[model samples]
Every structure is written in C-alpha cells, then in structure tokens.
Target chain A: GSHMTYPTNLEIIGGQGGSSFSFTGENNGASLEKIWVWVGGWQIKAVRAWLSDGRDETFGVPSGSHQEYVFTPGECFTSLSLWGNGAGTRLGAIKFKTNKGGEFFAHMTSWGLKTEYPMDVGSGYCLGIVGRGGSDIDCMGFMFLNAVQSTVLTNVNYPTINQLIPKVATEEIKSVSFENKTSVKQEQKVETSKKVIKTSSWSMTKSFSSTFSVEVSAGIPEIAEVSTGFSISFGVESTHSLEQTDEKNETLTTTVEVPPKKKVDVHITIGRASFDLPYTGTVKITCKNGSVLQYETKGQYKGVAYTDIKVNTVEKDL
Target chain B: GSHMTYPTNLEIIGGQGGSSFSFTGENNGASLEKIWVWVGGWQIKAVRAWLSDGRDETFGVPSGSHQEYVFTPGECFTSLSLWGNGAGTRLGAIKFKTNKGGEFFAHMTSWGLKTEYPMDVGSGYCLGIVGRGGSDIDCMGFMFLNAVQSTVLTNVNYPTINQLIPKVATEEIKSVSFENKTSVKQEQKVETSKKVIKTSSWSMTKSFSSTFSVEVSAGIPEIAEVSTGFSISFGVESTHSLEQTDEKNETLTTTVEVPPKKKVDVHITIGRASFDLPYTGTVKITCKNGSVLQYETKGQYKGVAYTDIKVNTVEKDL
Candidate 1:
C-alpha cells in the first residue's frame, strides 16, 4: 500500500515571483491530511499544509481571513484548478477535487476576470503542492506521483448495485420465540503491510414505522419473476400470506412481522479486515438465541490507495 | 457628509439559530471600513467587522482560514447575499456589492447546494451585518440605512464621456521656445459642511508615445461635425496640417508635436475643492514663463453622499 513514492513531476501555474515551497508525500512518509488558506483583498495571503505524519508546514505570513479543509482517511486527490489574474500577480482562488466525489473551492472575492489553470493528473495521483509565496501566493502547482494505483475510501457497509431489490413482499406474524445465549465481543485491526482494507460490522435489527397487513395462515414457496423483467430463486417463510392472480402468473407474500415498534438485533460481521487484491468474503450474522446465519458475499471490490485508513462499523436493530 | 445614521431595518437570511450580533454605522459616527471572514470546511467559521471609527466587533471563534476586504474612502455597500444550507446548520458563503461597481465574495468551498439570499437595498444602503454565530455562523443578516443616498469613490482624474475624441490629427513642429519662471504649488481640500464634491487638477503637458505624421503649416478654426454624427465647436492650432477633401466639403486637422522624446510641463489648477451642489468652473493653466491660459468648463456633475471624502490631483507633461 505504500508503493507510491515522491512525486515524479511538479508543474506550476500562475506567477512565479514569490519564494518557492514544496511538500511531498514520499512513499515512506505520510500523505496530505489537511490544509489552511488565508486570503486578503484580492490575493492569497498564506497557506499551511498538514501531512499525515503530524507535521505542518506554513508559507507566507499568517495574516488575513482564514479557511481550512481536512482530507478524510483513504481519500485521494486527482486534480486542482488555480485561478488568478492573467499576469499572475497573485492567486485569487483555488479548487480541488477528491476521489470520493467531493469538490472544495475558496476565493478571494467575486469570481471575475480571472484565468483558470486546471491540472489533471492523468494516470497519476496528486501527492503534494508546490508554489511561490511571499506576502501572497504568486503562483501554485501540484506534485504528482505517476504510474501508481489510485485508491479511494469506500463505504464498505453501504449497499451496492448487487443489493437492488424489486417486488419485495412482507407479512405480519402472530407469535415468535427466542432463546438466551452469551454474547461475545470481537476485535479486529487493519494490517498495514497489506494493501489497504476497510472492515465493517453491522446489526440486522430493522424497525418498521407502521403495521403491515396480516393473515392467519402461511403459503407454499413458488417460482417468482422479478418486477424488473427477470427471474430469480425466490423463497418465503411460513406465517401470514397474501395472494394475487394474473394471466401470466401468481404472486404471494408469506413472511410476516411481529408488530409495530418490534425489532430484532442480529450482529453481522465482515470476515476480512484488510486485503490488497480483490476479495470474496462471507458475512456472519449471530442471533441472540445462539443461532447463526451466514451468507457468502462475492464481488470484485477494487483496492483503494491511502495515506491513512479508517475502518467503520454499523450496528442496526431489525 | 456623515448623514447615514444607524440602519433603519435589519433583514436576516439563512437559519436564525445562533447568537445574534449587530454593528451599526451611526449617521453621526463612522462607516464600515473592512471585514474579515473565516471559513472551515463547508461553513463560515467567524466574522469581524471594522468601522471607520477605529472600532471593530467580532462574532464566533477565530478559527479556520481567513479572508478580508477594505472599503475605499467614500465607498458605499448597497446589497449583500448570504448563503448556507437550507436547514441552516452554518453559513457557507457571503457576497456583497458596492456602489463603486465592486463585488466581494467569500465561500467555505465549492458553490453547490446552498441557498442564496440576495438583499438589495435599492434606495437604501448597507451599514452593518447582523447575524448569529457560535462555533460557526448559522445565519446572517444586514442592517440597512434607508432613504439615503449612496456614495462611491470616483476616479476624479480619469477622463469622462465628454473626453472622447474622433478623427484627431497631429503634426511635428519645426521649433519651439519657452520662457523660464517660478512655479508655485496650490493646496485643495474637501469641505465637510457641504454635499460631497470631488475636485481634480491636471498638467497641460502632453507626451506622445510614438512619432506622428507631420506637415509644416497651420489651419483655420471652423465648426466641425464629430465622427460620432454630432456637431461641436472645433478649433485648430497653428502648426502642421493634414487635409482631405470630399465632393461636398473639406476636412483639415492641425496640431503640431515637438518631436519624439520631448515634453512640456504646464501647471493647471481647479479653482473649487468641494461643493454640495452642481458646480461650473474654469481650468487655469500657468506657464513657466509666467503667462496664463484659461478655459471655461461647464458640466452637471452628480453630488455623492459620503462618510469620508478625498480630493485627487493629476500632474501631466505635454
């Protein structure tokens, strides 16, 4: 995961009158973590950059109005656009985009009569920024690491395209039973030596806001076609049932809920903590009554490049 | 000229969820001179306003990056727009416009998904800002001085619409002479008791950047029609001349130059410094040899309302 070394190329834009500065996210060093910018009147007064190694570098005098932004763990920057007068007297505005579909912009005043310099790191990723700054930033540029894989922090617990459901059905159940069992606490950590891996655990306790229709009897499982013009293996639990008939086929809802304000706490954990390559893993759900429900999750999840990695967890009640 | 008292009405936009603050330009006091805004992430972190009276007021914590703008003497702000989330968690941006054809804007980041509140003062003018702020500015408002005239700092020495010339001609002269004499400097200041009046004086000397086509003769004065399809009293000087003839009439241009790298220094003075109402005055030019040349200038110049006034001057070489 730390294969990205210092940037191979540095390209500067705008005026180059002030003192020059450079910051690099060496493969052996931490990546960019945060930034602070100060602007006064029509010029960028100063700038401060924070690296993941808990070190910060500031350029120019720290005077004027201030603004700042923090990069999320595992986020990567791909490009930056600098704006100012055509003569490059000073920097008036800056905008940058993150791999996580985020855009950040800051300006000196109104956006008018300014030239734009957009630097795109094609097949590369931005590791640091370089520029000339005295009383103000006379010009700016970005440092890029070429021939490296780009990684983004993905929401490992969020639903993806594979989870899209069509024609879902539910019913109300009259009664349910449960057994008591010991709950164990588990701990997991990321392996820094491997490709970055994000781990997450979830609880399966979903609470319905309103009451659903109910029936006294259950129905048998049947082959059903999806509403999205496709057929899949379908199954339902025995409880209350609803039936409808059409010229093409028949439809039925067989699963039932306990009642309004009722929920079930089911703990689900992702097996892999971190992996560099594509991984096919399993999701294990542990019920309160000592019962276990497991499902195989198979997908080609892409690896994300990162300076810092974070693992998120979600616990839900069904 | 400090006729603008405290604002008559205060209109706030965005979420009204934070602590309130108010700063006023009491008619008897001073006007707004400068401002500082700090933004962190997607919200405005803080704001500070400085009045001409040498006093400043700040709201919220002094964190994040910074930006600032200073108003010129006699400048007036007419409107302001506040931007933030629809639910009003914090402020994301602020923009204001001045009567001097200036616009200032500051933002937390990119311009997206934020509500804009443009408060146009119309006949009124903005005197101060009233808003809420804690860790960040949740909402914002403006204090306006109504039924008052807006004043702007005008570049008094620059040419106006009446100075446009068309089909002008110049010629090189054979020789020139000058008479030596003493030079005296005059002082002019703005009047505080009267309506705002901007006064400026210029030197009669003119310098040409390049050599012009030349002849040896002079032309007679006559009425000429402007190239813009208008007629005005026209006069030519004794020097080299250029002539063009059409079937109906003949056009002649006369005004000789002393050759390249040569310039003249003639002192010109504006009689009146500042006046509340319209003024008709004369421009007096004094030669180094103690001779005087006078020209009567008549025009309807608008009076500007102001908290502070300045009289500008321009010295030129012919």
Candidate 2:
C-alpha cells in the first residue's frame, strides 16, 4: 500500500543557537523523523523524533555553524524518527563553551496510504529532505497512511523507510579554547656513600655496628651562584650476598647538618642479618652537597655491623 | 487489503504458580490488524509491551475473557505478552500441589497486501510460564507456546513478569501457656496527668517558679493492694513565659522508702521560667503503677504553691 509523498526540511543549530523550519497541511497525521547536525569533521549530532504522534519536534544546536535537515511532505503520519548525540570536540566545545565548526545532514522517512475506507485500510507514502551548506530550507510533514473502518476493528501495516540521505552540504564552527598557561620547574639531586664497620663474630647472632655523618657546605656566592634545596638518604649493601639475599640484624646511624650546620641523627637497626661466609659489603652515606662517602671492608670478620655512633658535620653556603 | 483467515492455536502453560505470555510475528505481506489471547480466568497482575521493529504500533489488552477483537498492528514487527499469577487452592482436603494448565486463543483481524499485508511474512508465536511460590514447586522453568521462531524477533517487545500467588492458605496462630505468655497482672501501671497552671499576667522580666510532685504509698493489703515504680520528666511548653524552654533545664528529685506500707515523693523544679504571655496550657505528668495512676490538681492555678501530696487508693478484689 503506497501513496503520494510529503516533504519537510530541518535546520541545524550551533551550540547555544538553533535553526527553524515549517511544515504544511493539517499536520494532524504528519510526523517528524530525525535532524542531523554537525560540529567539526569529527562530531555529528542528531535530533530524531521518538514515539512520534504527529506532533511538533525540536533538535538541539550542534557545536559549530549548526546545519540540520528535516523530513519533507510530512503531511502523512507514518514516519520514523531518529535519536542520537553529537561527538568529539564539537560535543566538548558545546558542553564546555569551546568554539568549533563542522558539517551535518538530516534524513526523514514517512509513509502515505490511499484507500476508500479511510477508517478501514489504505496505501503508504515515503518522504525525504535535503539542506545546503549555508542555506536554511523548509519541508512539509507526512500524513497518517492507513485508517481503519470501525474505531474497534482495524488492520494496518505501514512500510518502513530506513536510509534517508541529505541533498545539500553545510559547514559550521566546531571548537574554541578558553585558557592558555604553562607550569614552573624545580631541581632535585641524589648522592650515595658507604663505610665499613667491625662486627663481633661470623655467626648469624654476632653483633656489628657502624655510624656515619653527613656534612653539607654552601658554595660561595658567585656571579651565577644560586641556592638550591637538597635531601639525602643512606643504605648499605653486602658484597658477599646476592641482591636477593636478606641482610638482617644490622645497625646503622646517620647524622645530617641542617640550617646553621645543626646535626640531626637517624638510627636504623636490623634483626636476623644473614650473609655468605667472609662477608664483604659497603656502608654508604649520602649528602645534599653533591658528596658521597663510602667505607669498604672484607675478611674473616664476615658478620654484619651495628651502626651505633655518629658525628657532626659543617655546613657551607653554596 | 484483507487476506484469507488462517487460524493458529498456541499452547500456553499457566504453570503451578503463574506465568507471562507474549506474541510476535511478521506482516507476511499481510498487516496484522488485531492480536488476542485467552487467559482462562487466571489472576492477571500487569501487562506491558512495545513495538518490535521500532515502528509505532497501536494495541491494548482489553479486560475480558476469550474474545475476538481488532487492533492497529504497527508498521514494524509487533509483540503482545501478558503476565499473571495462577488461582485456586489445591483441590483436596490434604491440599494437592498445584499443576500447570494450558489455554488456546486466536488472533482474528484483517490482513491485506495494501495497508494490510496478507502473505504471512513470518511465523507467529507466544510464551508463558509459571511463577515460583512454595518450596515444592520449581519456579525457574518456563512453558513456550510454540517455537522460539514464533515469539523471538529483532523488533519484539518483552513484558516484565513479577506475579507470584501462594497455593496454600495461611492462618494466624496464638498460644496461651504462662511460661510462654506475657502476664498482665504483674505488669506496671502507668498514667498521664495534665495540669494547666495559667499565670494571670505576662511577666517577661520577672522570674517564675513552679513545683510539681508525685506521691505513692502502699494501699490496704486486705483490699487489692497496689505498688508502683517512679519516673519523672518535665518540660516547658511554648505558651509558657520561661526564658528557656529546654527540657534539660527541668530537674527532678525523688525520695523513696524501701519498707512496705511506706511512701515515696518525686519533686520536679522548673526553675527561672519567665515568659511573655498569659501563660496557659496543660503540663502533662505521666505516672504508671501497673499501667494505672491518678491525676490531682487545683483548677488552673494562677500562682505557684507547695503542699503535701498523698496517693493511696485501694480497690476490691475480684
């Protein structure tokens, strides 16, 4: 059951802006489908009729120079509607107030029916529309295709129009930026040092102790001299054991100079230190003044050391 | 546009519990004018469905038994489903377990090629099942009307079924054993007493004071003696001219005798209550002695007073 066609044009609106079009006929049976609008080449938005019942419909503005298309000959009621959102920067620009532009299209499909029994049964009609890149156009709405005989008795099957293409092309703004800024930078440095200390025995329970101090001196002010903040960390590694081996029950103490060369001490103690016989490792100390001190030792004194004592160091302006 | 009549009977399983039924079919070159099903007097709960092929379809499940009717079959694929719980207790003195039942119906309407396609476009079918009720019946199973092809389609609408009716009639039970019962005689008595002490004049700047007390004494044991516990709470209403209406400011002090035949006194002091108004309203004091008490007061006193209070009432034994 096919019949004559109705025409309707859709307008595309940009973000915060809208487009307008008109339809002819009783519009009583007329229905609207979807309006496609674009912003930027990457973003395309569509406003389609949903649960359409021969009523007025509206599509939101696209991101750029919004151009939308509507179905024409919308005098008939049997029309399919579309629904979807915009994409990419166009979406973000519109949502976040960014400026951008793109192209868009719209398609409308409707059915018209013709028969003696306006209330009984009839034919179907299909419709479509197109728009120019910059020009706005108007299209008509479709009418209700089939009417049953009795208000209670009715058998109607309407045809479906799937793919509707736009005839004209249009361009619009897509995206816009709000702010431009940069970030600042700071400098950081790391240093290492080590020292050897005596232990009590080679047994796993033997006691070993070692103490180290960090000295920081400021550099004398020169033509290009600049003050920089610094930090230090210290650790000891046993040479006789693999990196996977655990070094337990060892003690180490560290003292650092702050402000006016004040000494601050930190003590570390480990329990159950184990290593290969005739143990050899380095006690390392780090300083913020780009200096490292190391003490290496090896022998039948293969046990771990306990860091017990500490000393004060001088601070010089650098 | 009407086509030849081809009747089809779909078997529906009204399971031991209840179940839902849905309909699906193609135009078959013949537009489906009307769709109907037989419920066989089952207790229906709710019914809802949508057009399958995204096309607008007008249809409704009219309230009635097995009947023929005409309806507007939307342009797209259409589905009709019903949801309901079963009825009737098992038919025996011992209450037999419920068993699923079946029903038959027809979709009577005009189908033609024009507005109404006739050539049976696709297979039509319905689905129904029983709901879960008791531990005896397995509620997870469903009874299909015909084949999946009849009810399954891309554009088919599904109904949400959530109806469950019990097969057994449940009754309330009560017990009367003393150990498993609550005793009314040994319970405490409580009563609320209201006294409205209205001031003759509004004294916003002047301090106002009022005292209320509860007195309890052992009644004659020969008659029906009653002993009561003590509790006190006081608060100033908005109508009072008290500087602060906070209930926390109201202090209560009580003195009680441990020996029988003795009396206890409870005193409440509403201090420094000064308000701007012709103060009026009831100050309700609730007292309970096995859920009963007596209220004593002079007619709406204008000034505060302190007097000895006594409460020793006796009742005849039944």
Candidate 3:
C-alpha cells in the first residue's frame, strides 16, 4: 500500500547455482507482497527461505521469466537460499520494502561498505540488503516498484525491468535499403546541335533513365517486444515532364506494388523528344519505419529540378 | 481515474510528424492527462501541445514509438499545431476520452466511414484517419493489455498483440527438435546360443553420432524494453543407465554462459560400450522461457524402444 510514514518496503541483484545469502541484523521487521526472480534452469528448483515465523518455506521460481512469490510480514523470511539446476544468475535483486518506511538489499553472505545502497524511500537508518542462512548476494538486484518519488502526480510510477534477453525479432517483414554502389543513376544525351548540322535530321531521339533497383529483405526487426500491428506501406511518386512555352506539356507518373521489407526499382523513363523545351522530374519516397530505407536521391523535379536538364534550341525551325 | 460517471474518455486517434490538433466542441468541456500518438519517423523528434491558458509544452517522441502528452481540461486548449521537419502524415490513429457521454472522431479533414477502423479499441466510426490539415493511416494498429477479465484468478488469459512482424530468433540458444531425417543412427548384432553350426560368426563394431551444432547468439531479449538487471543462467542435466540387471549408471551435466537471445544446439552424445548388456538414455534441455526444450530419447531408438535388445545365453566360457 502506502509507504508514506513507515519503516521498510524500500527496494532491491545476481548469479550462479549453489549460491546462498545471509543477513547481519535479525528482527528488523520487513516484508513485501512478492519477490521477483529473472532466472532459469533445469528440473524442479526453488528459493528456500527461513521465515520470521520460526518456520522455513520454499517457493517455486520459473526460469527465463519475471517470477513473483508472496512474502507476509509475520511469515516473512530474512535469510534466503537459492537452489537450481544451473550453477549461477539481474532485475532479480532481492530488495523488498516495508510499510513503515525504509528499504534493504538482501545481503547473501557478505555486506561490504561499497554495496551501492538507497536513501529514505532513505530509511532513517544505515541501509544494506538483509536475507537468509547467510545469503551472499554479491551480484543479486530488483526495483521496488511503486517507488516513492520526490513528488507525486496523477498516478504512481512503475519502475521497469532491464530484460537483457531481447525477444526474437517479431514479424517476418519485408525490409528494404538503398544500394551504396548505384542508388541513383541518371544519364541524358541531347542531339539538338547535331540535328541542325544536317537538314534531313528530322525525327531525332533523346532519352534518359534513372536507374535504381529495389532490393527486398525478409526477417524480423530485432527490438524489445511491444504491442504489434506494425505494418507500413511504400509508395514512390515519380513524375517527369517537358515544359515548352505552352506547347502541350508532356508528363509521366508510375506506380509499383513492391515487396514488404525491401526497396524496389521504379524507373522513371523520360524518352520523349522535345524542340527547344526544358524538362522537370522528381522521384519522392513515401515510405518509412524501416519498411524502406537508405534513400538515394537524383531528382526532386518541381520546375527548379529540370531547370538543369541542359536545354539547347537545336533550330527554331520555321 | 474512473471514467464510469464521466461522459467520455471512453476511448480514442491520427497522424503528422510535427502537427497539432484542435477540438471544435471546445467549451462543451472535457479532459484527459495523456494524448497518445501512434506515429513513426526519424530522430530527436517530439510533440508540442498548447493549452487554453496559452501555456506551451513540448514532449519527446522517438521515431516509431507510442508517445503521449499531458492534458487537463482546466489547462486544456481548443486548437493545436505541429512543428517538425518531416513532410506530413500519421498512419497512427489518435483516440482520447473525456467526462462526457458521447463520441465523435476528430476529423483532421474528412474523418469518414471508409476510414479503416479498429475493432472496441476499433472505432466503427469510419477508417479514414483524420489529422491536422490531413492524415493518412493506411498501415496501423494497437494491442489490448491486462484486459478486463470476467474473473481474476487462475486460468487467466494472455492477450496477444496485432504484431504484423514476427520476432527474429532472439537466443542463439542450444535448440532441439524431433529429427526430420535420421535423428539417429545405429547398428547392433548379438548371437543367440552361438548355434555352433553358424560357422565363422565374425567379430564386429558399431558407433554413431547425430550432428546438431551448439550455436551461440548474443545480446538481450528484444521484447519492447523492460527493466535492467533481468539476466538468467542456463544448465543441462543428462542421465544414462544400464538396463543389464540395473548396473552402475553414468550422468553428464553441463553449463554454458550463453547469450540471452537465439536458439542454439545442445548435442547429447550417448556413446558407450557394453559387453552382453543393454542400455538406455536421454538428453534434455534446461534452458529458459517456455521453450527450454530438451528432448528425451531411450537413441537411434526405434520401436517399443529397445523392446528387443534380445539376449540369449551361450556355452559358459566352454
């Protein structure tokens, strides 16, 4: 409940099988709702404890998970012993709090002067972990969730656990990226002047193509597990146009229903011949959140883009 | 914190890398402390909210993350704008609730029926995601956690997410599976009564080993970040016994300071020699999570499992 005005419930360590812990001061009167352990091993194993009730109890601790067990005050055990199939052991520090006001780490066999301790939320006392038949928690730890902060807000803060084991990448997504070698390749040739040199140079051809291939990759994203439903769409808007003082302007737009996780090629072909006119073209990507990546830009055509399309009035043929 | 008597806050969503939103029914009065966004984009970005009192506030929002900002009716505002470098969009929907008794989807533009919606958490109110200026939610979705159960006890339910992406194998762990092709190999020969007439009974030797590598994967479990200090240990226990009048047994136990993710292979070698005797054994995994799969086998074991390790007595050293 509320640790606003009391003695213990403060907060929370690590490792190896056959590891046991001990406490120096007895009868400090401390307990918590649950004890959590991030551990795993083979066969039937448990956290054995000697309670304040002159009785001993052992509880089951599941492996590779955040396990919680009950700890009542009168039956709350001070010293703890861990027995498992593994020889050794994080977010598993044995730091349980009290109702009155204070916290202590469960000192498995030793309590040195440098074992990083906590303040009142600072028990008005010298703080250190307290645990069973000599529990030596040289590396064991845990967050006293519902931790008392300097100030209170709308709701209580929930301290998170640093789960070292990243979950397998979820989602067999189709991922994509740009090619460092030739992300964008654009080549153009204008035969205007050559046409003027020859009277019968009618029907000349000028063409240019931006080369970029869309590569696809299938795999899961390596990140902490979250609320899934992560689907992203990729759309590239490529437009090419030829603008000559009012003559019917020519433009082209294309679309591709590519793969989910990889980048795909959507070539913007500008093969139209124009007389004394400028060109405009752009290739914009409307994809993000890793469904696509490594963008290599070659055009952003919007008038200013084609201004450099190299224009040459071959001949103002009357 | 209870929305029971309140008119709204019943539930709520939309998009933009740096845009704001406005509620037209302003003074009709409502409030909530958090405005969650299902937006994704590039680095060092954030959401800024302006309130009625003209107080400007900014909050950090990492790309591709669920971000929420503070909002209270007293200090709440009617219209909000965005400020970022991204072009535009939020495939994520924005849903908020107040103390009122009805519902209406915020139309950043035309929040209509085709507005692909979500199911309870799914708004039947059209699917077109509405946002400031306009938002497009072609790809988006959420999860229901700690769901309101009919009862709270054992046999509890685990709600999964709408994860479109599958997890990459997290642990390069020692994995195991029923052998698809020859999971075992062995050849044995025994003589019954020497059948004196069975001339030239040859001396023989047989051995076998199925190959399964112990691959190691490093790093932490990738589940959407939990707390630190969540580390675990691994071990394996193997047992071997002689079926010959219950002779002495042999057992092998091992430990690997394995990485937290991915599945590895644990090769269980049950190679041994026996004179006029039969044997049986098993190799099991004591890994972590719900998947510490260590298979047990009685070896190249086929049929009623050695039901016919048939033995017959010949002449006594005659």
Candidate 4:
C-alpha cells in the first residue's frame, strides 16, 4: 500500500562511550540497519541492529571508528536506542526535509526503554529500564533538525486551506483624492429694489348712541340740548297724551333737534303722557353748547315713548 | 441690461450687407455700443451678425489673433441694427459668456415686426424692432444659455444655446453611442454535452378451455383423458350420491404422477360431473394431430365440483 510522504531524517548516539546503534525504517524505504560510534578501549557494546516495520533489525558495530548513515526515498527511522554502562552518552540531533518545504528536528530523551527486551536481544536497554533506572544513568540530551510541512497536512491544497497561508510581500498604491470643489456658481441677482403700490375700497356699518338726563320740578320749565352733530340719528319716545271723545285722532309727539354749536336737550314729565309716539327720525346736530346751533330732521320714528332716554352711542372721528 | 461674453472675430456674413453691428462689453466693463460693420461694397439684403462666447469680458470675443477663442470673465455683446428697409434682417447668432466660465449662443430668425405679421412680410422678415414691432427675436435661445451657464461642455468645439443653458441641459438625454474603443473586460461561458435516462414494469392474466368432449352413444369409459395428454376428465351416467359417514378428519391430496409424454385418444359419457382441484404444477404436452404439438403450463389453477370448473388463476413467471 502506498503511503503519504513524511520526508524527514533522524540521528542517534550511544551512551557511556558506547560506539554503535541501530535504527528502524517506516512506511516503505531502504532501511538504515545500524550505525557505529567509537569511545573507550573497552570495546563496549557499540552497535545494535533492528528491523524497521517489523521487529527492530539489529547490526554490530566494530569499535574505533564512528559511522554515519543516510536514507533515500520511501524510508524513515522509527526510533533510536543507545548502548553503554555509564551515563553521558546519548543521541544527537537528526535532520530531514518535510514533504512541504522546510527542515525537521528530533531529539533523544531519558524516557525510552532501559532494558534490552527480547524483541532485540543484544541491544542495550532504553533509558528508563531497570538496569538504567537512575536519572544519571540515562542518555538525556538529544537534538535534531526542525521540519516544514503544510499546516493542514492535506493531500491537495484547496483554496479554502490556501487562504490560511500568510502573504510575504509588501505593496504600495496610488490614488486621486478628487476634491470635488463643486461650486454652485450662484447667480448674482441684480439687487433690484422694488416698491409695490396697492389700493382698495371698503364699506362698513356702525351703531352709535348718546345719553342725556335732565331733572325738572313740576313747576319749573327747563330746556336741555342733546347735540348729535351733523350725522344721521333716529329715536323713539313716549309722550303725554290728551283725550277727548271725538279727539281720538289727536296724538302726542316729541321733537329731536340737532345744533351746530350747542347741545340739544328735551324736557320730560311722568303724568298724562301720550303712551306711544312716532318720534323715530333722522336728526342732525351741529353744536354741543355755543351759538352755532342748528337742527334738521328727516322721516318719523314710530314706537312707544318714555321719560327715560337711552342714547345708543356717540360718534367721534379718529 | 448686462450681457455675457461674445467672440469678436466670428461674424454673421450672409445678411443685408449695410446693417450696422456692435459688440457690447459685459461684467460692468465699457460696452462697445454702436460699433459699425460697413458693407464695404458687399450687397445683401437683411444683415444680422453673431459671435462665439469665447471672448473678452466673458461676453465678447477675446482681443487676440489666435483662431481658437477662450471666453474668460466679464465679456459680452449687445447687437443694434442701424439700417432697416422693412426687408426684416434678424440677428443670426449672438454668443456670450458669463463671468463664471459659462458660454452661450443665440440667433434671431426675424425681427419682432416681421413675426407679428409674418404673412405680409414672409418668413424671416422681422428685424431692428424694439417693443411691439421691434421684438427680440431668438431671445429664447439666449435665455436658454443663461439658465444652464455652469455646466461644462466636453468633447465639443462649438457651444449651442441648449448646451450652454442650465435648466435646458438638465432635460433627459435621449441617446448616446460609443464611437471609439475603450479598455473594458468581460467573461463568457460555453457548454459541451449532456444526457438523461429512465425505467418501468407491468402484469396480466388469461383463461383457456379443454378441447375434448364426451359421447354417450359410443359407450366409452365414464372417465377419459378429454384434453389429450396431461389432461383430466370425468363423467356421470346419473346423479349418484356417495357420502362418507363420520368424516371426522379433513383430507389433503396432491398429484405426484408425471403426465403422459404424447396425446392419446379418449372419450367420456356423463349427465354432469365436476371436480375441485388446484393445478399448482407444471405440465408439458405433445400433440398427435395439431399443426404444432408442444404446450406447457406454468401457473396455479383451481376450481369447484359441478361449478362449470370455473377456473381461477394466480400469477406465474414471465
């Protein structure tokens, strides 16, 4: 079965002057069966082999010379283990290219198996095994190259996924502000001063009245002038009546006068009066009290007459 | 009373040659009142003149020799006709410009007098009239320029009354066309091929009768193979009743015999007889006398005794 490419590399080192190591490959590729490292003259277990994608295939390493290994396409290293009796020996940094475009790194830590399990008998135990239980007995420091790959790790880069990648360039743009000085160019109206002349005519009706009260003892003859100066006025009043069997046609009447320069007044009595008199008429008075007195009347007023006189209004000019 | 700028060089040539011409200065400048254009031996009836607004005072032609005129601020012209034979010469085109970069053009087809009694004078007869008989012909065109003074006229070398006028320019445009190619982009789509499909099912039934018959005169067996091979037949000389007593148990029956391979002669004598049976079986027949001998049965058949063997059929494989 074909698998996707991981495309990375790894490295391993020995412990306590141990010289050789073994590495397994993953997926489908040429395996890195073993590697060798040199340290002390004791000829310690320097290299071990292990099968990758199966049991770890192991190989032996002759003491004295350190060995380097490489991997081709379709191959990878699963895990790396070291061999030695003492601490201070450990794996080194491993580097490889990821399928995308960058480098990757892997390191060895103290947490690997400590004992040589039956799976790979001659190999030394991993870091955490009983034989390598102490913290100082383990190979700790390990480093490797960093890797580069797609953030989504998809087989094909879809547009939705490509949007996640960061842009890597700078840009500059030019534009016009287009200051729209849109002047209205208002019309300079010829400052013309205009005067409009208008005329109209109208008619109106006004009600007016004047009042006069006079006191005359039964034996005293008195004269009172009520001047309605040079304007139309009409009045109704009750007058004293005289009766005779054949004189029923005889009726009492009162005279209203207008004076040009004097006030006109009339005398009144309460007894033996003609109850109804035709005194309604238009009168012109020209005076309030001086010698320029004048009077004129037109038509007769017909209504009841009374001693109390009620003048409706007096007219004055504005 | 103030006027817009007008061009000086541009003139109306074909008119009554002796008519006096004048260009008036606008924008509070000195108006060139009564400037005369002598016929100089030119002979033509009814002379009228015109100007382009591209001139001095923003109203009359600028004082320069350049063929192209530039109407700036404060320029205009006022036209007065000096000679009048009642032949009716009209201002052909009066152009002017506003202080605010506005241009205008106007023409008087006939003086007002000619227009009023156009029948007597004929068309284009009115000229040199002020009020009444001296109407300002073509003033409408001048007023149009006054209304639309602010708008710019692009891609046009000459200005007309409608183009220069403000309110007139606002009227809805009728049509426009592109005369030259411009940079524009668009997209289109194309199609290749297509297809479709469909499906359905059905059912039916039929009835048949056996061809062989019974003959009492022949004295043949009471039961015979009336339908030839693979057929069942029965008969009754007289109605005889046979009842099984007790009949406590029900009965189940089936036919296990393989039918005859070929047709055989048969006969039967019976007053009436019937049987109830279910075919639920297959049959193949070979005929002795028919043109085509082979026949087969594939569905279920059942009937009641003495019921005319009215058979009912179930379905079968097609």
lDDT per residue as tens, model 2, A1-318? 855322222222222222433332123222233333443332233323321234443333344444443333312221122211231111211110000111222322121111111110011111122211112112122232221111110111111101212121111101111111213222211111111222333211111110011111111100111133111112222222111111121112232323332222211111122222333333332222122333443333222322321222333332
Instruction: Please provide, for model 4 over B1-318, each residue's C-alpha lDDT reduced to its tens digit, 9 standing for 90 to 100.
Output: 955432111223222323233332222112221111212111111212222222322222222221222322122212111222234433333333222233432233244222111011000001111111122221111110111111111111111212221111011101111111223322211111000010100000110111111111111012122333122333223211111011011111111221223211111111122222222211211111111111222222111111111111122111
Best by TM-score: 1
lDDT tens digits, residues A1-318, model 3?
833332222332234333444321223211233443433222222344343223344334433444455544312222222221222332233343332222334322222222223221221111123322112222322211111111101111111112222222221101111121343443221111000000001111111111111111111111222246222111132211211011111222122333333333322211112111111212221111111111121211111111111221121111
Docking quality band of candidate 1, CAPRI definitions: incorrect
TM-score of chain B of 2: 0.14
Candidate 2, B124: how far from true, in Å? 69
Better of 1 and 3 by lDDT: 1
Give the whole-model CA lDDT for all candidates, comma-separated. 0.42, 0.21, 0.22, 0.20
**A43-143, model 4: which lDDT tens digit per residue?**
23223323222333223333444444423221222223333322334333232331113233332333333322111110011111111111222222112
Q: lDDT tens digits, residues A1-318, model 1?
A: 634323244557667688878776543224567889887667777788887656688877777567887877545554466777555677777787654456688777643546566543422234567888887788776664332221111222222323433232221111111122225333321111111122211211111000111121211222233345422221242322111111100111122222323332221111111212222334332222223323443333322111221122233332
List fnat per candidate, in order.
0.00, 0.00, 0.00, 0.00
- What level of docking quality does candidate 3 show? incorrect
Chain A only TM-scores, each candidate in turn = 0.43, 0.16, 0.17, 0.17
Q: Which prediction has the highest lDDT against the true structure?
A: 1
Clash tally for model 1: 24
